[PDB]
Amino acid sequence: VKSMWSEGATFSANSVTCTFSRQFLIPYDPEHHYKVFSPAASSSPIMGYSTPWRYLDFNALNLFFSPLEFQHLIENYGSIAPDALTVTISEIAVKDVTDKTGGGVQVTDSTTGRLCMLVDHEYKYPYVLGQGQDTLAPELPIWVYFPPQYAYLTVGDVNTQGISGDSKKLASEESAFYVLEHSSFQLLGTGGTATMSYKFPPVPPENLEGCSQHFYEMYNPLYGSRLGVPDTLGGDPKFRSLTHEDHAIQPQNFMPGPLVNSVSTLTGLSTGTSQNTRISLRPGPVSQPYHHWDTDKYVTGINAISHGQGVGRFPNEKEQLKQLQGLNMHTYFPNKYTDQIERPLMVGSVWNRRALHYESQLWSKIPNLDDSFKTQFAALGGWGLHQPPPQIFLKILPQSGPIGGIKSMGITTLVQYAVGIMTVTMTFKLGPRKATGRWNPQPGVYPPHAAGHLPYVLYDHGYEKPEELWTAKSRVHPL
Amino acid sequence: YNPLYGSRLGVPDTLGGDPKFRSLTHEDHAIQPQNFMPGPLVNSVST
C-alpha cells in the first residue's frame, strides 16, 4: 500500500475535484480545564467556555484552488456549487518531550500516546466554524497548520453587581456546559487514519459571469414606448406619449433590489438599544456592494470589511454598479422630492449578488432559528446552509504520570504533542458557460495589480497577495 | 463565533475618503461582522 500526499484539482466538463494537504499540529494544554470566562463588562456582556480541544477550519476558497486553477475556473466555466467533501487525517506521529535540563527540549517518539478525534455528525455542539476569524489554513502548502482552540458563547443571565455599573453574564438554566468527552472518540494512535465524508445539500450556483447589458436598458433603443408618462399634476393629468429619446422615463417592469444603508465614507449600520449597546451588522446584506470604481477613484463605503491589511483589500464589485446598485444611490419620491438612502424590497426586484472572490468563504451556517429569508447566500462570501460540514475536534490525551504510590511525582501531564497530515478533498459541480454570439474577444482573466508588484509569486514571507481581491465575474452573460 | 481569535476581516477607523482600515482582536464584540441580519421590526415599541 502506498502512502501519498495528495494535492491538485482535476477539471471536467462536469464537476472539478480539488484536494489539498497541510501538516497540522495539535500543540499541548498544560491544564485540561474548561475555564469559563470572567469578562465583567461595564457601560449585555458575554459568557463562554474554553474547551481543551482543537477543531480545524478549511473554509476559504484559496485552499482548494491554486491561482492557475482559479484562473482556469473563471475563464472556462459559468457556475460553481459544491457537492461532496471528505477530510482524511493521515499519518499521525504523537510524540513526547523529555526536558533535557541543560538542553531544554529533547523530542523522542511515543507509541502509547493517542489523539482523540471526534466528528460531530449530529450537530450536538455549537458551530463556530464559518465566522471569518484569523485561523484558517496556510495559503501555501509548505507552511504548517496550527488548528485553533475550541470555544463557544452561550446565553446566561445578566446581573449588575459591583460599585458603579459592573454587569456580568452569569449562568442561567438556559446556559449549557458541553463537555466533549461524552462522545465516541476515534482514539487514533500513531499511524492511524480517519475520515469524515460529508455530502453537500443541493445549493444554488454562484454564476461566475458578469453582464454585457444594463437591466434597466433592455429595450430597443429605437421605437419609443407604447405607454405614456404624466405631464401635468393636480387632478388633471394630461398624459403624453414617448419617443425614442425618453431614456430617463422609460417604464421598467422590474425594480432594483434593496439598498439598506449603502453610503460612502463607528459600528457602521447597527441595531440595539438607545445609543451604546449597538451591536454591528457590518458587511451589509448580500445585496449590496461596499467597494466599486466611480469615474475618478474607488468608493469604499461605511459597511466594508477589509479582508486583510492599513489600506484594505476590497473586492471590486463592478457588476453591482452596473445593475442600478452602488454606494451613493438615493431613491426619490414625489410626495408632497424626498431624498431617501434606503431602498425597499419592491415586490418585483433583482439585485444580483455581491460577487465571490478567490479568498472568500464557502459556507457559514444558517442558524437553527426559523423563518429564514433568503439566506441561501451568506455575507463574507460563501453559501451558508442548514447542516454545514461538521466540526472535527482533536484533543490529544491527558496521559498523567508518574505517581510513585502517594507522591505527585513529575509533571503528571507529562508533555505530548501530535503532528499529522490533513488531506481535504472537495468536489464542485460546475455549470457550462453561458452562450454569446459575441464576436468580440472577452476580457482576459488575470488578478488585478498596479505596477511592478506582480500577483501571487515569490519576491526577495516572500509570497505576496495583490492589493485588490480577485473577483470572479469577468466574462459577460449577455443578459 | 469563537470568543477567542479575533476576526480575519477589518473595520474602518477614519472616514471622509481616506479609510485606513484596522484589524480586529478578540475583544471587538460590538463590531464583529455578521453574515446574517435580523428580521424586520415594523413598529415595535412599548407603552
Epitope: 470572567s38 474554553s50 | 481569535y5 477607523d13 482582536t25 478578540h26 471587538d28
Partner: antibody
Framework: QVQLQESGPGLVRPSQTLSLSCTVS??????????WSWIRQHPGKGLEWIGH????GTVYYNPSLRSRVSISIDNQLSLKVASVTAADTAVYYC??????????????????WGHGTLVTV | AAALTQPLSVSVSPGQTAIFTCSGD??????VYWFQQRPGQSPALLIY???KRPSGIPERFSGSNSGNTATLTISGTQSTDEADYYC????????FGGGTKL
Amino acid sequence: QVQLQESGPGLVRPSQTLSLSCTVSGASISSGGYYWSWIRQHPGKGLEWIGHIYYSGTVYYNPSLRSRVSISIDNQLSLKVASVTAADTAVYYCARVRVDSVRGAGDNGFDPWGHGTLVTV
Amino acid sequence: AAALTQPLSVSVSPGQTAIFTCSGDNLGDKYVYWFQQRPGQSPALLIYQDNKRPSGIPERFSGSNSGNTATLTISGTQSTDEADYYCQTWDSTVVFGGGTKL
C-alpha cells in the same frame, strides 16, 4: 510616541471616593486593541495590579480589590477606588498592553507607562 | 503561575553578572516579562517574551524561561543598573512578582 499623564487629587483620609484620571497623548484610546491598566506600587514593596479596561466597556479587575475599585472610560481612564479605611496610598501608574491574539496567555507587556501620581491617605 | 516567587535582593560588582530567579509553577509554558524600575521613575519594559528586547533597551539584557523558573541575566552590569527588577506573567488576569532589589 505615546505618553500617558495622570491626575492626582491630593489626600483625603476619612473614606471618600478616590478619583483619578489618565489622559493619553500621542494616540487616541478608541482606535483599536489596547488594554489600559491601573497599577499600584507600595513604597518598599513590589508592584500591584488593580485592573485594565478595553474601549468597548469590558473591564477585568483584581480578585482581591474587586468590590472596591471601578475602572471606566470616557476618553479619560478613570479609577474610583472607595472604602479607604485600609490606608493604601501607594502610587498609581497607568499602563497599556496590546491585546493578545489567542486570549489564553499574554503576548504583550506594559510597554508605555505613565509618569505616576503620589496619592496620600 | 498565580503566585510568582522572587527573592529579596542580590549583591554584585562591576565586571560580572547577576542572575535572578523568578520561580513559579509551570512557568516554562508561560510568558515572563521583566520590568526595570529605576528609583523615582516608572518601570520600563526590559525583556519581553523571555528572550526579546525592544529598541530602547540595550543589548546587554537577556533572559530565559525553562521548567519552573525564569532568569534574567545582565551581561556586564554598569553603575546605572541598581534598580528593582520585577517579573510579570499572565495567569488569566495579571501576576506581578516580588522584585529583586539590585
